[PDB]
Structures are given as C-alpha cells and as structure tokens.
Design an enzyme around this catalytic site. Structure first.
Site, short mmCIF file in Angstrom:
data_model
loop_
_atom_site.label_atom_id
_atom_site.label_comp_id
_atom_site.label_asym_id
_atom_site.label_seq_id
_atom_site.Cartn_x
_atom_site.Cartn_y
_atom_site.Cartn_z
CE1 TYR A 31 -3.61 -2.24 0.30
CE2 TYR A 31 -2.84 -3.33 2.07
CZ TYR A 31 -3.58 -3.27 0.99
OH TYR A 31 -4.56 -4.43 0.97
CG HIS B 196 -9.73 -0.58 -4.90
ND1 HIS B 196 -10.23 -0.68 -3.52
CD2 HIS B 196 -10.71 -0.95 -5.73
CE1 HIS B 196 -11.50 -0.93 -3.76
NE2 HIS B 196 -11.78 -0.96 -4.98
C1 CB6 Z 1 -0.59 -1.43 7.89
C2 CB6 Z 1 -1.64 -1.77 6.91
C3 CB6 Z 1 -2.31 -3.27 7.08
C4 CB6 Z 1 -3.15 -3.68 6.40
C5 CB6 Z 1 -3.88 -2.92 5.58
S1 CB6 Z 1 -5.45 -3.33 4.75
C6 CB6 Z 1 -5.58 -1.95 3.75
C7 CB6 Z 1 -6.43 -1.68 3.16
O1 CB6 Z 1 -7.48 -2.70 2.79
C8 CB6 Z 1 -7.78 -2.80 1.25
C9 CB6 Z 1 -7.73 -1.68 0.39
C10 CB6 Z 1 -7.77 -1.65 -1.08
O2 CB6 Z 1 -9.00 -1.18 -1.32
C11 CB6 Z 1 -6.84 -1.03 -1.63
O3 CB6 Z 1 -5.87 -1.43 -2.63
O4 CB6 Z 1 -6.73 0.35 -1.50
C12 CB6 Z 1 -7.86 -3.28 -1.54
C13 CB6 Z 1 -8.69 -4.23 -0.65
O5 CB6 Z 1 -8.74 -5.42 -1.11
C14 CB6 Z 1 -8.18 -3.95 0.63
O6 CB6 Z 1 -8.93 -4.89 1.53
C15 CB6 Z 1 -4.62 -1.22 4.46
C16 CB6 Z 1 -3.79 -1.67 5.21
C17 CB6 Z 1 -2.63 -1.14 5.88
#
Ligand code: CB6
Ligand code: CB6
Ligand code: CB6
Ligand code: NA
Ligand code: NA
Ligand code: NA
Ligand code: NA
Ligand code: NA
Ligand code: NA
Lengths: 138, 138, 138
Positions: free
Chosen positions: B19, B96
C-alpha cells in the site's frame, strides 16, 4: 509472554449442544489459569463489533504480540479482518469450538486460515488452551 | 465544489510493500492540497466501522455531493455499503491503492464497481488525486 | 404478546421507486397501530450497526419473543446475524419490502431464510403487517 485471545460475534452468549456449556466468563478464567501455568499472560477480549475486533488486532500488530482468534461468523465473511490479521508479525492461531467441517458448507471456508500459522477446530474450548500451549513451546 | 473522500477499514494503518509508505495523515494533506489547486474542497474521513461509513455516504446523498470511496475489505463483502452508495446522485469514484486484479481472486470482485461512475486501481495514492481531477473537469 | 420488529442497514432512509414512499417513522406508526388491532405490542428498532442488531436479537432470544427481521444488505452477507437468530426459540419471520427475486442475483441468497419460520418478500411495507398477523393467529 503476552498472548491476546480475541473472540468475535456471539461468543459472549456461550453457555449448549454445539458450543458446549462453558460460559465466556468461565472460558476467560480457564484461559488465564492455563496461561499462568505456561508462564504466559493471556489478555482475553470479546466483541460483536468488527471495528472493535479490528482495533484489538491493530494493537497486537503494533505490540508484535501473538493472537488466538475465534472470529465467529466473521471467519467466513470478513476481508477487513483478514487484512488486519495479515499485519501481525507474531503467530496467529485460528480456533473454532465446533467442527466447522461437519456443519453447513459455508462454514468450511475461512478468510483467516490462509494467513494463520495454524488452525484448531472441533476440540471445544480446549482448543484455546492447546493454542496457548503451542505458543508457549514456540 | 465539495468532494467527500471516504476510506474504509484498515486504511488508518497506512504507512509499505503493498500500500506504499504514505500515512493516512499525509494522504489527507496531499488530497487537501490537490483539491485546493483544482478549486475544490475535499473532506476526508476514515473509519473501520461500516455503520460510520454508511452515515457518511448518507450525508453525501442528502447533500448531492460526489464521493471518492476506498472501502477497503468492505469493497468485496458489503451489500449494505453498495445500497447506500446507489442513493448517490453525484458521481461515485471507487479507488484502490493496490492493483486488486493482481492479487487474490476474492479481491477481483467488487459490489461497488457496477454502481460507480468509474474505478481507479493500482496507481497508489495518486489514484485519489486523479479521481479529484476527474471530478474537477466534470 | 410482544413482537420485535428489527430493521437493518439503510432502512432508516425509507421514503421511492424500489422501496416505496413510506418513511421509517410512518412504518413504525403503521406497525404499532396494526399490532394494537391484533392485541400485540410491537417494539420497532432500526440500526445500521450489525453489533446493535445482534444485541437486539440476543435480547429477543433471552425473552423468548418473536422477531420480524428485515436485515437489509446483511441478509445476503452476515453469518454472525444468522447465528444470533438461530438462538431464537420463538418464530422468526424474514421480511423484504422489495421482491429480491426480481433483482440482482446476489439478492436471491439469504443466510436467514433457512433458519426462519417463513419469509415474505415483495409486498411492500404491508409485509410487516402481514407478518404480525401471522404471529397473532399463531
Ligand atoms: C498497515 C496496513 C495493514 C493492512 C491493511 S489493509 C489496507 C487496505 O485494505 C484494502 C484496500 C484496498 O481497497 C486498496 O488496494 O486500496 C484493496 C482491498 O482489497 C483491501 O482490503 C491497508 C492496510 C494497511
Ligand atoms: C448461545 C449462542 C448462540 C449462537 C452462537 S454462535 C457462536 C459462535 O459463532 C461461531 C463460532 C465458531 O467460530 C466456532 O465453532 O467457534 C464457528 C462459526 O462458524 C460460528 O459463527 C456462539 C453462540 C452462542
Ligand atoms: C433511500 C434508500 C436508499 C437505499 C436503501 S437500501 C434499503 C434497504 O436494503 C435492502 C432491503 C431489502 O431487505 C428489502 O427489500 O427490504 C432488500 C435487500 O437486498 C436490501 O439491501 C433501503 C434504502 C433506502
Ligand atoms: Na495486549
Ligand atoms: Na473442550
Ligand atoms: Na461533506
Ligand atoms: Na501513487
Ligand atoms: Na422487546
Ligand atoms: Na405495501
């Protein structure tokens, strides 16, 4: 040293055909006793709120603490919970009181299992105690 | 003029392999700056609670304001969120950060995409800024 | 005597192409009036929070009271809600305002229907009133 045991929705209602007759308060007592015997400190929490569960997982990730998680129905449904758990650096052990493989087909799928260290199902509340023992010997 | 940017579960934890290394506070700052440059006002909100997200979507529907939504794991799971978003009269842009099409199969399904104006994935946090620019030129 | 009518996410927003023009406050009034005519007392509650819905179901289980439930989008998604409802000893009637069988395929699956006494769909808000009448004659 510190292990977090997190219980998800409906697990506050424990106490008998499918999930046994042990109440959640009794479960906390049994876990705390076993943890002490193993030289661990167990912190046991339960919520019906996914946001609350996420916060407790976030805290465990920040503290690099292991988690024993029985996510209840969210096991089968929550990608958000899976993603929070994927941040954990210490082990994640998934526990189910009931044998989810002997029940409805929808219960045989878990978003958590692929990212867990391991999974214990069907051994009743002893599954939590066995998860603790795994963590103590590792 | 006003654009709502709503972030769902776990997005408060931003900050790096999948991310990126930009924190949520930095993201808010970058969005506010870009909005200003485009003559917009961005209101950025994040919650791990589906009920809170629903309330923010309801407010946008009542105000006839556009929404840029990164629903996190709820993208793949929440019909309730989809139904709230279907009430929006102004555009909905789904964003996303990661390329969900290059990850687990479950991430390739969105309840939101069919009711969104459009969708941006895999362009990192710049996706939010590009969504703003779309809204400014429309 | 007491019947609980529980409405899930987005149903606070009622008031017109798919769900009709009756507001949630009007629905509560209509239900209370019909219950009185049938010699029942209806307690009507709505929330966008799954944890709140679970608590209301838990209360009905402890009181051995019937439930008329329109779970909104959670119908199609929540195993946690299904499991709470499976504890109910009195009847559970699932109601949907819209004909979910004439809409998107995802709406044609319910986690609740297999554990409900019965299901009424597509009859508008009169479905709640018909559910009450079933409970009164049983
Ligand atoms: C430190 C940390 C640990 C776990 C997570 S999970 C997350 C965001 O969740 C999601 C975001 C998406 O919308 C994207 O690509 O922006 C994809 C989606 O499948 C996912 O659950 C951000 C994040 C940060
Ligand atoms: C009085 C009562 C009524 C309903 C329910 S549902 C519940 C736990 O929910 C779940 C737990 C499992 O994780 C397990 O076997 O531990 C299986 C999972 O499929 C289920 O949703 C506990 C419980 C207690
Ligand atoms: C202003 C507005 C905007 C969006 C929405 S979504 C909603 C109710 O959600 C649902 C209700 C159903 O249970 C039904 O037919 O009663 C069907 C279910 O698929 C849907 O999520 C009501 C409502 C009102
Ligand atoms: Na702790
Ligand atoms: Na046991
Ligand atoms: Na706003
Ligand atoms: Na970027
Ligand atoms: Na009641
Ligand atoms: Na009607």
């Amino acid at each position: 040293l510190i292990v977090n045991v997190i219980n998800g929705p409906n697990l506050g209602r424990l106490g008998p055909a499918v999930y046994g007759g042990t109440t959640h308060d009794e479960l906390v007592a049994l876990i705390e006793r076993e943890a002490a015997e193993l030289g661990l400190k167990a912190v046991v929490r339960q919520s019906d709120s996914e946001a609350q569960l996420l916060d407790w997982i976030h805290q465990a990730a920040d503290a690099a603490e292991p988690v024993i998680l029985n996510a209840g129905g969210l096991t089968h449904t929550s990608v958000a919970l899976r993603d929070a758990c994927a941040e954990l650096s210490a082990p994640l052990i998934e526990v189910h009181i009931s044998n989810v493989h002997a029940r409805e087909e929808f219960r045989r799928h878990s978003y958590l299992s692929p990212i867990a260290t391991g999974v214990i199902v069907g051994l009743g509340i002893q599954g939590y105690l066995l998860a603790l023992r795994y963590l103590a010997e590792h």
